[PDB]
Design a protein around this ligand. Structure first.
Ligand code: GTP
Ligand code: G1I
Lengths: 359, 202, 57, 338
C-alpha cells in the first residue's frame, strides 16, 4: 500500500535531517596525528593536553608504579655480572639471589619485606656504580625518579600526584585519542599505535589531517634501539624521518617537529663522560650559526649542541608543497607544552598557506 | 561596417561568460559574472517607454557589479585577516531603477529632446554612491592583506590585475560624470562604451 | 635454539604438501569452459535485460 | 642443526617445482581459442547514492539483493535501499576508523570492524526499533581487514598480525586459530558451500585453509608484489587474485598452477578489488587510476571501461542474481550499474 511508501519517506526525511545536522560539526574540526620512534614521548603529550585544556582527566593507576619499581631495580642488579668489565661492589648479598628469584614471576612481592632491603641496594655504592654507565644495557628512562621516592607510596595508595603519574610508562594497547575543548573548533589528536611496523600500510588512510606532529628524542645519541646493536637511537629516527617526508601518500602535509628530553640532554653534556664527537664524526668542525637566539638559561657550551641536532633534521627537509617547523620542548614541565601550544596555533595554516588565493 | 565588426565582437563576449555559466565563496561570484544591443541605433527607440528601460537596466547592472565585487573583496579580506572564522542586489536596483520610471529627471531644449522620440540627460548621487563608496572600502581591505604577505613579487603582480584594471576602466567614467560645456556630448558615450568591456574581462 | 625448533616445524608441514594428488591441466581447463557454456542464459549482465523485466528501469 | 634443517627444506622445494612442470599439458589459451568473443560491453549508471561525508572503504550486498550496507571514514553505517534510495538506518560508531563491513545471510546482524581491533556486531531487528551493540570481540591484535558470516553465530576475521581466527558470538572467544603467514593479511573470501576459504597476505603468497580441521592445504606464489583482493569462481574450484602490481592472475585448486595473467602495457597502477559475475564469464576489477575495467575470464582482453568516479574505487560488489553492479570510491559517492 501507499502507507508503507509514506512511512519510508518519513524515515528518509528524519535520517536526512540527522545527517544534515551532523555534517556541520565534521567540516570544522582540525585533526592532528602523532608520530615518532619507540620510547620518545608521544603518549605523554596526549595525557598532557587533558591535564591542561580539559577540566577532567585511580586505584588501578597506583599499581603500575609498584610494577615499574620491580623492573627498574631488577635490571641494574642483573647487569652487574653480565657487564663485560667487572663492576661488582658484601652488603645485601643474601638479597642478590632473592632479586633473581623474584625476577620472573607473575605475582610481585606485595609484602613489605621486599621494599625494606631493595632500598639498601639503591643506597649501596655497587648499584650506583652500575647506574653511572647505562649505555651497554637497556634501562627505563624514568628509573631514577622512582627509586628515590621509595616507600612514600608503598605504605598506601596515597593518591599519587600527577607529576608522579605522568612519568609512569605503560604500553599502548591500541589507538589513543583525545578531543579536548577549546574556544575554537575542538581538535582530534590521536596516537599512532602500539607496536612498530616497517611496512606501515595503514598510513594510506591518513590523507586529510591538517598537520602531522613529529616527536623525536634528543638525549639518546649513545644508546642502541630495542633490538641490540642495531644503530644509534638518533640515527634510527633520522631514517624514519626521511622515509616519512618522501612518501607518495603524504605529498601536501606539513610537519611540526618537537625535540623532547631537553633537561636530560643538558645534564649529559655538562658532566663530561661520552662526547658528541665520539659518536658523531662531523660535530668537531661545526660552528654555531649567527642566526641563533639562545634563551638566557644555558651556558654557551650546551647551546652549541642543540643546534647541531636541529641542523641534521632540517637539512633533510630542505633538500626536497611541504614545509617544516622546528621547536624545543620538555614534555613533563606542564607550562612548556602550553607555551608552544599557545604559539604553535598562531601561524600554521594560520595566515600561512591560509592565503590560498593565488598570491 | 565598423559597428558590425564590433557587433560580432560584443557577441563573442557572451560566450566567455556562458562557458563559466563550487564553494561558499564561489556562490557569490556566480551572480557577479552573470550580471548593449542598442548601441548602434543607426546613428532607434521604437517605443518611447522602451528607451528608459535600457538605461535603467544598464545603471542597475553597473551598480550591481560594483556591489558584488565590493562584497567579495570585503569577504576575502576578512577571511584572510581573522583565522578560524565562525540582499545588496535587490537593494541597489530598488533605489536605482525606480527614479528612471518614476519621472525623476531634469532645459527648454531638453524638454524638446524628450518630446521628440535617445538623448541622455539627468543622478550624480547615484554615481558617487555607486563608485566612490565601494572603492574606499576596496583600497582599505586590500591594504591590510599586502602587509600580511610582507610579514611572511607575485602578490603585487596579481593585485595589479585585481585592482588597476577596474580602476582604469571605471574611475575615468566617474570623472566624466562629475564634469556635468567643456565636454562633447558624443565624446562622453565613448567613455561609457568601454564600460561593457569590463564584463568581458570576467 | 628457537630457530632450530621453528625450522623443524616448517619442514614437517612442507612434507605434507608434497604428497598431494594432481590432475592434468587439459582436463582442468576444459571444465571451466564447460561450466560457462551451461549457464549462459542466466546472466543478465551479458545479454541486456528488457526494460519491463529490469526492476531498475 | 640449522644447516641440516635448511638443506632438508631446499630438498623439497625442487621436487614441488619439478612435479608442477609435469602437470602442465597445454596452456589455457590453446584450448580456449575456438570460441566467439563477447564483444564490446557498454552500460550506464542507473542510480547514484549520496549522503556520505568521507571516503567509503567497504560495502556489502544483502542476501535478498535489495539492501546494501556501506561504511565510511567518519564512522557511520547506513543501510540503503537500492530500489528507491531510502536510507533506513544511520548507526554511529565508537571508533571513527573503519575498514570492513558485512551482512548476515539472515539479514538480522551487521558486523563492522576497524582499526580499534574490535570486531563489534550490531542488531537490526529487535524490540523498540533500535540498533545496539550485541558483543565486542577483543581477543585479537593488529588492525582488521575483513569479516564474514558463516551463520548467525560464527564470524571469521583476518588481521595484520599474520593470523586468521574463527570466532563465536555466543561464547565470545576464538574457537580455532590459523597461523603461517609472514606478512600482513589483507582479504579473504569464503567458498560457496562454506567449507573452505583463502587469504591473500602481503608477502606475495596465497593459501587455502580448512574451517573444521584448521590446517593449511596448498600455497600459491606466482606473484611478484603485494596482494590486495581475492574472490572465488562460482564453481568453487578456482579463485582470482588481484595484486599490487597491474597483473591479475587466476589460479586453480585441482591443477595447483597459475593459468592466465590479466595485464596491459598501458597500465602501471594497482588493484583494489575484484569480483566475478553470475556465470563466471567476466572479471570486474577496480583500479587506482580513478576508474574501473572489465576483463574476460578466457580471452584476457579488456572489453570495456566503466568510469567517471573521479576518485579511486575502493570497494566493489555484485548482487546474487547478477542484476546489478555496485562500486564505491573515495569521493563519498556510490553508484549502481546495469
Ligand atoms: N625526564 C623526562 N622523561 C621524559 C620526557 N619525555 C618523555 N619522558 C619519559 O619517557 C617515557 C615516554 O613514555 P610514553 O609517553 O609512552 O612515550 P614513548 O615511550 O615514546 O611510548 P610510545 O608513545 O607508546 O612509543 C616515559 O617514561 C616518560 O616519563 C622528558 O622530557 N623528560
Ligand atoms: C549610458 N549608461 C549609463 C551611463 C551613466 C551611469 C550608468 C550607471 C550608473 C551610474 O551612476 C551612471 O551615472 C550607466 O548605466
Amino acid at each position: 500500500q501507499r502507507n508503507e511508501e509514506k512511512a519510508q519517506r518519513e524515515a528518509n526525511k528524519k535520517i536526512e535531517k540527522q545527517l544534515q545536522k551532523d555534517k556541520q560539526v565534521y567540516r570544522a574540526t582540525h585533526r592532528l596525528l602523532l608520530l615518532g620512534a619507540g620510547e620518545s614521548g608521544k603518549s605523554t603529550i596526549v595525557k598532557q593536553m587533558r591535564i591542561l585544556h580539559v577540566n577532567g582527566f585511580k586505584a588501578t593507576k597506583v599499581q603500575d608504579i609498584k610494577n615499574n619499581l620491580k623492573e627498574a631495580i631488577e635490571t641494574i642488579v642483573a647487569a652487574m655480572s653480565n657487564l663485560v668489565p667487572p663492576v661488582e661492589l658484601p652488603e645485601n648479598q643474601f638479597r642478590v639471589d632473592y632479586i633473581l628469584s623474584v625476577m620472573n614471576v607473575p605475582d610481585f612481592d606485595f609484602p613489605p619485606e621486599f621494599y625494606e632491603h631493595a632500598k639498601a641496594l639503591w643506597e649501596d655504592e655497587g648499584v650506583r656504580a652500575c647506574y653511572e654507565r647505562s649505555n651497554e644495557y637497556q634501562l627505563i628512562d624514568c628509573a631514577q625518579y622512582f627509586l628515590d621516592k621509595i616507600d612514600v607510596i608503598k605504605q598506601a595508595d596515597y593518591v599519587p600526584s600527577d607529576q608522579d603519574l605522568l612519568r609512569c610508562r605503560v604500553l599502548t594497547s591500541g589507538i589513543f585519542e583525545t578531543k579536548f575543548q577549546v574556544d575554537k573548533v575542538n581538535f582530534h589528536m590521536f596516537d599512532v599505535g602500539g607496536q612498530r611496523d616497517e611496512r606501515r600500510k595503514w598510513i594510506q588512510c591518513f590523507n586529510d589531517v591538517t598537520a602531522i606532529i613529529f616527536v623525536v628524542a634528543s638525549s639518546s645519541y649513545n644508546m642502541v634501539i630495542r633490538e641490540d646493536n642495531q644503530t644509534n637511537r638518533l640515527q634510527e629516527a633520522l631514517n624514519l624521518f626521511k622515509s616519512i617526508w618522501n612518501n607518495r601518500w603524504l605529498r601536501t602535509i606539513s610537519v611540526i617537529l618537537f625535540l623532547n628530553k631537553q633537561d636530560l640532554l643538558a645534564e649529559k653534556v655538562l658532566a663530561g663522560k661520552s662526547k658528541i664527537e665520539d659518536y658523531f664524526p662531523e660535530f668537531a668542525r661545526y660552528t654555531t650559526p649567527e642566526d641563533a637566539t639562545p634563551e638566557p638559561g644555558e651556558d654557551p657550551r650546551v647551546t652549541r649542541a642543540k643546534y647541531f641536532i636541529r641542523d641534521e633534521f632540517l637539512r633533510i627537509s630542505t633538500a626536497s608543497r611541504h614545509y617544516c617547523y622546528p621547536h624545543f620542548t620538555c614534555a613533563v614541565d606542564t607550562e612548556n607544552i602550553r607555551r608552544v601550544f599557545n604559539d604553535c596555533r598562531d601561524i600554521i595554516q594560520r595566515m600561512h598557506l591560509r592565503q590560498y588565493e593565488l598570491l | 561596417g565598423m559597428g558590425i565588426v564590433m557587433s560580432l565582437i560584443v557577441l563573442a563576449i557572451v560566450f566567455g561568460n556562458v562557458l563559466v555559466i563550487q564553494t561558499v565563496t564561489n556562490y557569490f561570484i556566480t551572480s557577479l559574472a552573470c550580471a548593449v544591443p542598442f548601441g548602434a541605433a543607426h546613428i532607434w527607440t521604437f517605443g518611447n517607454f522602451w528607451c528608459e528601460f535600457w538605461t535603467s537596466i544598464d545603471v542597475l547592472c553597473v551598480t550591481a557589479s560594483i556591489e558584488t565585487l565590493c562584497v567579495i573583496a570585503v569577504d576575502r579580506y576578512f577571511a584572510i585577516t581573522s583565522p578560524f572564522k565562525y540582499m545588496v542586489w535587490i537593494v541597489s536596483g530598488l533605489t536605482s531603477f525606480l527614479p528612471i520610471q518614476m519621472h525623476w529627471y531634469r532645459h527648454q531644449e531638453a524638454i524638446n529632446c524628450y518630446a521628440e522620440e535617445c538623448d541622455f540627460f539627468t543622478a550624480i548621487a547615484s554615481s558617487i554612491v555607486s563608485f566612490y563608496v565601494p572603492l574606499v572600502i576596496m583600497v582599505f581591505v586590500y591594504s591590510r592583506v599586502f602587509q600580511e604577505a610582507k610579514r611572511q613579487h607575485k602578490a603585487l603582480k596579481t593585485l595589479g590585475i585585481i585592482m588597476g584594471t577596474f580602476t582604469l576602466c571605471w574611475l575615468p567614467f566617474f570623472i566624466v560624470n562629475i564634469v556635468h560645456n567643456l565636454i562633447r556630448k558624443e565624446v562622453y558615450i565613448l567613455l561609457n562604451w568601454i564600460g561593457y568591456v569590463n564584463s568581458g574581462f570576467n | 635454539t628457537a630457530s632450530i625448533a621453528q625450522a623443524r616445524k616448517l619442514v614437517e608441514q612442507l612434507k605434507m604438501e608434497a604428497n598431494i594428488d594432481r590432475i592434468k591441466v587439459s582436463k582442468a581447463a576444459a571444465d571451466l569452459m564447460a561450466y560457462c557454456e551451461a549457464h549462459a542464459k542466466e546472466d543478465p549482465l551479458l545479454t541486456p535485460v528488457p526494460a519491463s523485466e529490469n526492476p531498475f528501469r | 642443526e640449522l644447516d641440516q634443517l635448511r638443506q632438508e627444506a631446499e630438498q623439497l622445494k625442487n621436487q614441488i617445482r619439478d612435479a608442477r612442470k609435469a602437470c602442465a599439458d597445454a596452456t589455457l589459451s590453446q584450448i580456449t581459442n575456438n570460441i566467439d568473443p563477447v564483444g564490446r560491453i557498454q552500460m550506464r549508471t542507473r542510480r547514484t547514492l549520496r549522503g556520505h561525508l568521507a571516503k567509503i572503504y567497504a560495502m556489502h550486498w544483502g542476501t535478498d539483493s535489495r539492501l546494501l550496507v556501506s561504511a565510511s571514514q567518519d564512522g557511520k553505517l547506513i543501510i540503503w535501499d537500492s530500489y528507491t534510495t531510502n536510507k533506513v538506518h544511520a548507526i554511529p560508531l565508537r571508533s571513527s576508523w573503519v575498514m570492513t563491513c558485512a551482512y548476515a545471510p539472515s539479514g538480522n546482524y551487521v558486523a563492522c570492524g576497524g582499526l580499534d581491533n574490535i570486531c563489534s556486531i550490531y542488531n537490526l531487528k529487535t524490540r523498540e526499533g533500535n540498533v545496539r551493540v550485541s558483543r565486542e570481540l577483543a581477543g585479537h591484535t593488529g588492525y582488521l581487514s575483513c569479516c564474514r558470516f558463516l551463520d548467525d553465530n560464527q564470524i571469521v576475521t583476518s588481521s595484520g598480525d599474520t593470523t586468521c581466527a574463527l570466532w563465536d558470538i555466543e561464547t565470545g572467544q576464538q574457537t580455532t586459530t590459523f597461523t603461517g603467514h609472514t606478512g600482513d593479511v589483507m582479504s579473504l573470501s569464503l567458498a560457496p558451500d562454506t567449507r573452505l576459504f583463502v587469504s591473500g597476505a602481503c608477502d606475495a603468497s596465497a593459501k587455502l585453509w580448512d574451517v573444521r580441521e584448521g590446517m593449511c592445504r596448498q600455497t600459491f606464489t606466482g606473484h611478484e608484489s603485494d596482494i590486495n583482493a581475492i574472490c572465488f569462481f562460482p564453481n568453487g574450484n578456482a579463485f582470482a587474485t588481484g595484486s599490487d602490481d597491474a597483473t591479475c592472475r587466476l589460479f586453480d585448486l585441482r591443477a595447483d598452477q597459475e593459468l592466465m595473467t590479466y595485464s596491459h602495457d598501458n597500465i602501471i597502477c594497482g588493484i583494489t578489488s575484484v569480483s566475478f559475475s553470475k556465470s563466471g564469464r567476466l572479471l570486474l576489477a577496480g583500479y587506482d587510476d580513478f576508474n574501473c575495467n572489465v576483463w574476460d575470464a578466457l580471452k584476457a582482453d579488456r572489453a570495456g571501461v566503466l568510469a567517471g568516479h573521479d576518485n579511486r574505487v575502493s570497494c566493489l560488489g555484485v548482487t546474487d542474481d547478477g542484476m546489478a553492479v555496485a562500486t564505491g570510491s573515495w569521493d563519498s559517492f556510490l553508484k549502481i550499474w546495469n
